[PDB]
Amino acid sequence: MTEYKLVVVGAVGVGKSALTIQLIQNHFVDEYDPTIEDSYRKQVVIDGETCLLDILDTAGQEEYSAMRDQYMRTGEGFLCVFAINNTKSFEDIHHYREQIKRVKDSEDVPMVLVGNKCDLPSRTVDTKQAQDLARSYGIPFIETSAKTRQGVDDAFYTLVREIRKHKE
Numbered sequence: 001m002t003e004y005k006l007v008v009v010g011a012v013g014v015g016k017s018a019l020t021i022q023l024i025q026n027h028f029v030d031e032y033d034p035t036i037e038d039s040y041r042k043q044v045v046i047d048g049e050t051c052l053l054d055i056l057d058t059a060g061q062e063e064y065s066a067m068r069d070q071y072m073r074t075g076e077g078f079l080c081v082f083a084i085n086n087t088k089s090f091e092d093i094h095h096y097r098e099q100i101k102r103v104k105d106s107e108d109v110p111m112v113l114v115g116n117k118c119d120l121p122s123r124t125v126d127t128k129q130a131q132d133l134a135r136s137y138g139i140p141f142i143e144t145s146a147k148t149r150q151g152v153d154d155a156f157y158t159l160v161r162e163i164r165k166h167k168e
């Protein structure tokens with residue numbers, strides 16, 4: 001197996017847990033303890049490669065430590081998640097990218113921008129806005145629904161592809 005260490009980041013309530021559990025366990029959790037942080041492992045084939053995905057679903061308080069810095073820099077690629085009905089979560093993306101670039105000490109870290117909850121009727125964050133930000137960082141952008149499972153496999157598999165590209 002090729003191992004890939006993925007970290008899922010973004011504001012409380014954007015659906016980091018629901019995206020992870022949809023990929024790992026194939027069901028939608030309506031309630032998942034917002035404070036619970038953990039890593040989940042999944043064997044999957046991506047473009048014919050047998051991959052062991054090790055996925056950190058981030059949680060807890062805004063706390064900076066040498067320990068947390070160390071845990072975060074073991075990530076090889078980052079899923080940067082906002083909700084399409086949460087303007088603040090979209091505005092917070094830059095902050096998360098800056099903390100990733102800081103602990104990785106690099107301007108090129110594999111990353112995918114994810115707009116989650118695309119099943120929801122009214123959006124406050126337009127696809128074009130998110131596309132614009134993705135093009136600026138030079139990363140892929142995908143809209144997902146942890147609820148319907150739309151885009152979920154594609155989001156994680158696209159991040160693995162970015163990590164492969166980075167390896168060259």
Ligand SMILES: C#Cc1c(F)ccc2cc(O)cc(-c3ncc4c(N5CCC[C@@](C)(O)C5)nc(OC[C@@]56CCCN5CC(=C(F)F)C6)nc4c3F)c12
Nearest residue numbers: 009012058059060061062064065068069072092095099100
């Ligand atoms: C996240 C993250 C994170 C990385 F992506 C990379 C390296 C990190 C190193 C660290 O020591 C700490 C973090 C980290 N951990 C938690 C974090 C955390 N919490 C509270 C909300 C939910 C959570 C799961 O994101 C955990 N929250 C934030 O920023 C939240 C905002 C909202 C209030 C003001 N904060 C600053 C901000 C902006 F836009 F300026 C967004 N950062 C965290 C962080 F950088 C790193």
Ligand SMILES: Nc1nc2c(ncn2[C@@H]2O[C@H](COP(=O)(O)OP(=O)(O)O)[C@@H](O)[C@H]2O)c(=O)[nH]1
Nearest residue numbers: 012013014015016017018029030117145146147
């Ligand atoms: N409608 C809808 N609700 C979602 C989606 N993803 C997550 N949720 C809900 O949004 C809330 C927060 O999700 P959670 O995964 O706990 O967010 P986290 O704090 O980022 O882990 C929960 O009530 C979830 O059921 C989605 O794609 N569509």
Ligand SMILES: [Mg+2]
Nearest residue numbers: 016017034059
């Ligand atoms: Mg969660």
